[PDB]
Amino acid sequence: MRECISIHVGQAGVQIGNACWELYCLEHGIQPDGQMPSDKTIGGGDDSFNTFFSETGAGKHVPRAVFVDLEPTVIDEVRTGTYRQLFHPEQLITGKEDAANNYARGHYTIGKEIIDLVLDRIRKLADQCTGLQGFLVFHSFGGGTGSGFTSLLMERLSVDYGKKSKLEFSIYPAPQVSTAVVEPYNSILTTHTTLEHSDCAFMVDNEAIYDICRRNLDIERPTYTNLNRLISQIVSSITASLRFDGALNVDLTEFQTNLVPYPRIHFPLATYAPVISAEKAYHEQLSVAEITNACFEPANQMVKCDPRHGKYMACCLLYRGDVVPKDVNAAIATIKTKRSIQFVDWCPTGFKVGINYQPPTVVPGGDLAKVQRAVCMLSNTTAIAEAWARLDHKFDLMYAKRAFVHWYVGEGMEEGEFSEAREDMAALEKDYEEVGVEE
Amino acid sequence: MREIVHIQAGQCGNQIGAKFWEVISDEHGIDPTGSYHGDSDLQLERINVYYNEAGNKYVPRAILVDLEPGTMDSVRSGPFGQIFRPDNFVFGQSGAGNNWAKGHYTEGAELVDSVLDVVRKESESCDCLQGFQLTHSLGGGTGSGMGTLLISKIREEYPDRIMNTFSVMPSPKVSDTVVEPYNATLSVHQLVENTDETYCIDNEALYDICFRTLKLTTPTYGDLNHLVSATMSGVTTCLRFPGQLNADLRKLAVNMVPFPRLHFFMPGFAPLTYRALTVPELTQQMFDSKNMMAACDPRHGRYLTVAAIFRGRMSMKEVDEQMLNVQNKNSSYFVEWIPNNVKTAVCDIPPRGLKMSATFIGNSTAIQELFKRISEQFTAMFRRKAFLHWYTGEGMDEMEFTEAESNMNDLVSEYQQYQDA
Amino acid sequence: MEVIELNKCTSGQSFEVILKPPDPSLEEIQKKLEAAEERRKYQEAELLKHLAEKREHEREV
Amino acid sequence: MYTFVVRDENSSVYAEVSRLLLATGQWKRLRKDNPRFNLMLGERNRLPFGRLGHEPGLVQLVNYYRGADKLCRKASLVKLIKTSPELSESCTWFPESYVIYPDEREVFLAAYNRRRREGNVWIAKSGILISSEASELLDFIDVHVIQKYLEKPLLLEPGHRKFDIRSWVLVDHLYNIYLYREGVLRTSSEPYNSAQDKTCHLTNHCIQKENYGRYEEGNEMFFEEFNQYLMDALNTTLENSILLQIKHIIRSCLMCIEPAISTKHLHYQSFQLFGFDFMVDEELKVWLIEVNGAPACAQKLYAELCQGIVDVAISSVFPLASIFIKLHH
Numbered sequence A: 001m002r003e004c005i006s007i008h009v010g011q012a013g014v015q016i017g018n019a020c021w022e023l024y025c026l027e028h029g030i031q032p033d034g035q036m037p038s039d040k041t042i043g044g045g046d047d048s049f050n051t052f053f054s055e056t057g058a059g060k061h062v063p064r065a066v067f068v069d070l071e072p073t074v075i076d077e078v079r080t081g082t083y084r085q086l087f088h089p090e091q092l093i094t095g096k097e098d099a100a101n102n103y104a105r106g107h108y109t110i111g112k113e114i115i116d117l118v119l120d121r122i123r124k125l126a127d128q129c130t131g132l133q134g135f136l137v138f139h140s141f142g143g144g145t146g147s148g149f150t151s152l153l154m155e156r157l158s159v160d161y162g163k164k165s166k167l168e169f170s171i172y173p174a175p176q177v178s179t180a181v182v183e184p185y186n187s188i189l190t191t192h193t194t195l196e197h198s199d200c201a202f203m204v205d206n207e208a209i210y211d212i213c214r215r216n217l218d219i220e221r222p223t224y225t226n227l228n229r230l231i232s233q234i235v236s237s238i239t240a241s242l243r244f245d246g247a248l249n250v251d252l253t254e255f256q257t258n259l260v261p262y263p264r265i266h267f268p269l270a271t272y273a274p275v276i277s278a279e280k281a282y283h284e285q286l287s288v289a290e291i292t293n294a295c296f297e298p299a300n301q302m303v304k305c306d307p308r309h310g311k312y313m314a315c316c317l318l319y320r321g322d323v324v325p326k327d328v329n330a331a332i333a334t335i336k337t338k339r340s341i342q343f344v345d346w347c348p349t350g351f352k353v354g355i356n357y358q359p360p361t362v363v364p365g366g367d368l369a370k371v372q373r374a375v376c377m378l379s380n381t382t383a384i385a386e387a388w389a390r391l392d393h394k395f396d397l398m399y400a401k402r403a404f405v406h407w408y409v410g411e412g413m414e415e416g417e418f419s420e421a422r423e424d425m426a427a428l429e430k431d432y433e434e435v436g437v438e439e
Numbered sequence B: 001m002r003e004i005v006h007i008q009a010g011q012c013g014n015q016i017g018a019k020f021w022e023v024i025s026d027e028h029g030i031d032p033t034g035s036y037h038g039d040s041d042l043q044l045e046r047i048n049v050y051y052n053e054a055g056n057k058y059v060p061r062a063i064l065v066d067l068e069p070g071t072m073d074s075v076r077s078g079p080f081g082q083i084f085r086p087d088n089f090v091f092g093q094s095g096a097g098n099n100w101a102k103g104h105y106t107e108g109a110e111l112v113d114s115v116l117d118v119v120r121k122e123s124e125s126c127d128c129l130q131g132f133q134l135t136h137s138l139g140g141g142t143g144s145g146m147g148t149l150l151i152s153k154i155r156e157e158y159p160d161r162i163m164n165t166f167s168v169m170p171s172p173k174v175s176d177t178v179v180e181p182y183n184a185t186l187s188v189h190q191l192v193e194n195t196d197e198t199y200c201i202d203n204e205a206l207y208d209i210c211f212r213t214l215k216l217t218t219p220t221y222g223d224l225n226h227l228v229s230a231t232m233s234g235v236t237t238c239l240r241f242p243g244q245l246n247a248d249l250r251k252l253a254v255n256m257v258p259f260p261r262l263h264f265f266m267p268g269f270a271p272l273t274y275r276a277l278t279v280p281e282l283t284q285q286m287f288d289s290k291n292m293m294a295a296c297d298p299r300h301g302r303y304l305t306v307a308a309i310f311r312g313r314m315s316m317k318e319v320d321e322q323m324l325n326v327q328n329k330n331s332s333y334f335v336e337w338i339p340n341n342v343k344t345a346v347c348d349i350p351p352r353g354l355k356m357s358a359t360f361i362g363n364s365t366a367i368q369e370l371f372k373r374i375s376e377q378f379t380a381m382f383r384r385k386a387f388l389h390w391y392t393g394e395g396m397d398e399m400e401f402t403e404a405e406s407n408m409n410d411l412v413s414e415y416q417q418y419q420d421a
Numbered sequence C: 001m002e003v004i005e006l007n008k009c010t011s012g013q014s015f016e017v018i019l020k021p022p023d024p025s026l027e028e029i030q031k032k033l034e035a036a037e038e039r040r041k042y043q044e045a046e047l048l049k050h051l052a053e054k055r056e057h058e059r060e061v
Numbered sequence D: 001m002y003t004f005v006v007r008d009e010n011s012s013v014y015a016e017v018s019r020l021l022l023a024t025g026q027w028k029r030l031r032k033d034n035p036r037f038n039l040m041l042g043e044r045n046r047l048p049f050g051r052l053g054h055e056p057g058l059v060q061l062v063n064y065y066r067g068a069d070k071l072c073r074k075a076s077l078v079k080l081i082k083t084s085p086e087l088s089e090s091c092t093w094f095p096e097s098y099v100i101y102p103d104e105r106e107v108f109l110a111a112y113n114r115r116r117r118e119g120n121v122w123i124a125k126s127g128i129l130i131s132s133e134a135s136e137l138l139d140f141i142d143v144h145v146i147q148k149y150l151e152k153p154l155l156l157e158p159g160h161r162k163f164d165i166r167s168w169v170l171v172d173h174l175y176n177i178y179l180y181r182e183g184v185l186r187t188s189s190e191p192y193n194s195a196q197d198k199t200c201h202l203t204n205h206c207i208q209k210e211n212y213g214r215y216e217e218g219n220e221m222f223f224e225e226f227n228q229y230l231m232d233a234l235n236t237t238l239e240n241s242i243l244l245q246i247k248h249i250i251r252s253c254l255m256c257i258e259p260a261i262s263t264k265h266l267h268y269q270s271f272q273l274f275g276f277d278f279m280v281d282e283e284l285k286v287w288l289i290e291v292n293g294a295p296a297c298a299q300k301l302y303a304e305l306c307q308g309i310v311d312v313a314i315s316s317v318f319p320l321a322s323i324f325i326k327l328h329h
């Protein structure tokens, strides 16, 4: 058994982290006080769920998690929340004033004075690990802390843990649910500084989650609470192989092996189905073929783009519920004859498939209905580069006038880092293109 | 704990400031004695932003400054006069004679250190100081001259704290003396350098609104001030009440100020005060020039950034729809090089006597019309060096006026740069 | 359309379906962090110098 | 009020469409790079499809189908027909074609040899060469496709002259296929000589303009006249002898690529107008020549067609305050 340490940075990372650990406890039968009746090895054990939970002599199962934010309001909701007993003070790190949506403030100004503390609290968890795999890092692109401090943290984790893998869960900025205008700057700045240090990153566009909540859950104005419960489900589907018995994606290294042939192109597209409103008294349970076909409808992707006009490098299918290989292969064969699924000529045209019989767990009183089978597809398609093109274009419009740039220079950043990061993104967009492409 | 320190200087500054504390004290359930008597804990969730907690009493974190005692004596006997900490009344006796030099160099210099001592004591008792806000006029001597002196001293001692101002711009329509363009021109350059936000409250606009819209044949300064206190309440709503936004002054400024010197905002309010307004009416009104308090036509310029907070119970799917319709109506009046530069926020608590309201904060290049107006009045007198003796008699030099004039013209040309870009 | 590497357990199973064959050091980090702090210190000193020149003028008036 | 932008100033068709929209009073044009639009009249090359459908609350529509180039490039069309089972190499209405890079060189010669006692005339194009000898065609190229030249074209009388049929087809956001009732024949003014001289072999409007204008105004015969000619000369109608095949070919091509280009459940919507070029042989069999993704219209038909675009493609999505034949599928 090898442990994984989750790190939650900024408001988005912390609130999403809180929603995931709630779901984790429900899936593993862990109660808010941290007790796990089904666990018979009191105070220890090397079960699959111990990759995310440590155990105390009193029987409490403690998340291997560290929450970091530069202001306390959000992490205070964890200290006083339903699962307060689950964590202990040394896991929750708060500053006094935040980065004010300013990457430079999160990376340089305020980051320098707290980076040593965070690494120490991470070392305390790493010291309890017999064999640490690496880190799962949750953060937003748009926040000054989520963007600025995360990139600094990722740099130092590559130094203090050169062998450990690092996976990201990143929230891509959507103006529908944002009152900021500088997030294109912060996104490009943090992607540039973090690219070399991340082995596999799962981008989630709030635009996509927002519309899925509106269209499939009948929520007229989705809140962060609505978005996060849906995001937590998808994160759970991605990390379930690390927390349950299985043979697919059982360690962070397999994520790169199975999803990232080229290191810089490490942003797999996630697609999830089915998302069913709990208000629907009864819903016709969807078949394996129907949920698998739904993995190729752009409306169900975590990032809105068109994989038909790109090329695949890898594709993983993660099923939860009543699913058997027979029905999976039957669905794939049918979907090949109806969908445009083109792989690169230097990869096999196949699907790695994992099935966990336990069906998706849902938060009591939430917006999601219980389903007998669900699937999350992880596909590394070049079509996700449409998200970089959108972001880089917004960057270009503002930076051509140096709009807001003085805020970053005022915190010690140099104007050259802007163009330095933008040029890295321009190379990233070309890498994707090389791989994917009056009368 | 994200504290804000409030300063009010001079006659105008203290009279709008007093009304501001009356309004929000009522919104937070604080009575003229400083005792809480509300029916919702939301009133107290962010009470510490503007109030210190004493016998379960809440005391405004407010400093009252003037060079004559008259206006502050009137505040101390006013409705909410007793809630202010007596030690925070800092006043001289000589007055400023509507003279920027008296406020900035002579009379004000003798009093400024005393004001900073109170500012320091209030800042010391702050767990985490967000920054400062100042209320003042630019056309007098104390608020304009000593107010900008205080801002310069505060930045020297607190260089990493936000400084925002609510600044009343003079107008011949509503004027006390002819030297107001001199005092305003001298003050604007100070604000260009040492404030992060300046809400430009034009007395011409406040008068036109009272006369043409509110049907008040003879507006008083009190009538103009009801518009200012109401606008100030809305502008500070996201700092004082729980809701969508929990941004501090710095984050709010970051998303509104793309260039350090172009931080002069056009505020607006709706409804202008039994039929509760529909959401389309709130939205259309807050973008109408007739609801804007800078006396600038937004159709003569372009918006760099816009922020609008809606207060009360309402459908926000309906607000999003109307904000789209008004943007389409004014599509050529928003810069195209700041994506998503129109943002909206909500608060469930409405102000007193309204089921719902909206407050507009526009960073428009049309504000240059206001500076050009002041600059033209300035030059009309300065060509002939008229009334300059009031200033040279306090040690000022002609060159300082020439430099303020040029600084004003540079500010106006910088706005015209981004209005064509 | 072959199935390979089928692994079964009590919790589930996994397999593959093939349809067709085909860093900076700590020192350098502290350097850049300290280089930014000194650009902040220099810019702040220019502000205080600018304000000090303003104090001189106030005394001269 | 609806908004739209223009990014192809060289388009005669959508220059009239923009004028018609402005003339309704309910449409307001914006600047080329303004992203808050309802309708994009996009450019021909490198259209930024990845930036569409990401503006909050705005329904966005574009006048081009992403991926339709596979049908509108001569080399891509050959590959699309031969590799798609819906069409297949056994396709009966597309001339025998091969892609050659300066590929299908070995297989092109194999069929070329099997012909050698069939007529063995071919045409290569991407710039056009017609020759009986293969070596002249292969060596001439030194991306192109070699296509069997149709040696027995239907020749109009009087004139003994060649022609091709242009059909305009509008595909809306619901993937309804609309065939403009009015087509046009681009005729050759010179007589067809089966015996290098490409005045009577190439029927392009520019090649004829550069006997022109003798038989009909501008070498443009419209369906009414061409129909009457078929009734008088050959005792048949345009509907029975040609249009049935044209409609079948249009539907086959577009339904084949529907899953690849459809915007049914996309975050943005697409429509596009296509120009299908057909050829008729002396036995009244219709052959597909090419499909044009950015075609112009006949001067007489600009007004009627452009109005149809607004009614069916634009106002269908953005309503205000038939000339098409619907090919059902």
Ligand SMILES: Nc1nc2c(ncn2[C@@H]2O[C@H](COP(=O)(O)OP(=O)(O)OP(=O)(O)O)[C@@H](O)[C@H]2O)c(=O)[nH]1
Binding pocket: A009, A010, A011, A012, A013, A015, A016, A069, A070, A098, A099, A100, A101, A102, A106, A140, A141, A142, A143, A144, A145, A146, A147, A171, A172, A173, A174, A177, A178, A183, A206, A224, A225, A227, A228, A231
């Ligand atoms: N999905 C989701 N997105 C969030 C959440 N909270 C914030 N965001 C997004 O994150 C971006 C803003 O960054 P934040 O994470 O709130 O800011 P931060 O990381 O705390 O950094 P600073 O506050 O500037 O110091 C916006 O695009 C928000 O839409 C959340 O709970 N869920």
Ligand SMILES: Nc1ncnc2c1ncn2[C@@H]1O[C@H](COP(=O)(O)OP(=O)(O)CP(=O)(O)O)[C@@H](O)[C@H]1O
Binding pocket: A439, D095, D123, D125, D147, D148, D149, D150, D163, D164, D201, D202, D203, D204, D277, D279, D289, D290, D292
């Ligand atoms: N296989 C073929 N058989 C007979 N004639 C052919 C032919 N291929 C081309 N032609 C003739 O040559 C002319 C020009 O060829 P083609 O249509 O490929 O050029 P083009 O792409 O420029 C047409 P447009 O101007 O509409 O874009 C055709 O209109 C046709 O008359």
Ligand SMILES: Nc1nc2c(ncn2[C@@H]2O[C@H](COP(=O)(O)OP(=O)(O)O)[C@@H](O)[C@H]2O)c(=O)[nH]1
Binding pocket: B009, B010, B011, B012, B013, B015, B016, B096, B097, B098, B099, B137, B138, B139, B140, B141, B142, B143, B144, B168, B169, B170, B171, B174, B175, B176, B180, B203, B221, B222, B224, B225
């Ligand atoms: N809105 C408003 N403006 C005022 C008030 N009192 C004065 N003014 C304006 O402020 C300017 C005079 O400045 P004032 O504050 O009286 O001088 P000071 O006391 O030396 O700062 C003129 O432009 C007046 O129109 C007031 O109560 N309300």
Ligand SMILES: COC(=O)Nc1nc2ccc(C(=O)c3ccccc3)cc2[nH]1
Binding pocket: A179, B133, B164, B197, B235, B236, B238, B239, B245, B249, B252, B253, B256, B307, B308, B309, B343, B344, B345, B361
């Ligand atoms: C004491 O000085 C201040 O209050 N300064 C100040 N600056 C502000 C900027 C914006 C807002 C908003 O209400 C808002 C509305 C929608 C989106 C984002 C923000 C409020 C502000 N208050």
Ligand SMILES: [Ca+2]
Binding pocket: A039, A040, A041, A042, A043, A044, A045, A046, A055
């Ligand atoms: Ca155990």
Ligand SMILES: [Ca+2]
Binding pocket: A158, A162, A196, A197, C023
């Ligand atoms: Ca590494």
Ligand SMILES: [Ca+2]
Binding pocket: B110
């Ligand atoms: Ca004295």
Ligand SMILES: [Cl-]
Binding pocket: A160, A161, A162, A163, A164
């Ligand atoms: Cl290591």
Ligand SMILES: [Mg+2]
Binding pocket: A010, A011, A069, A071, A098, A143, A145
């Ligand atoms: Mg934060």
Ligand SMILES: [Mg+2]
Binding pocket: A414, A416, A417, A420
């Ligand atoms: Mg650099």
Ligand SMILES: [Mg+2]
Binding pocket: B011, B012, B140, B176
């Ligand atoms: Mg006065």
Ligand SMILES: [Mg+2]
Binding pocket: B113
């Ligand atoms: Mg002293």
Ligand SMILES: [Mg+2]
Binding pocket: A439, D290, D291, D292
């Ligand atoms: Mg063509």
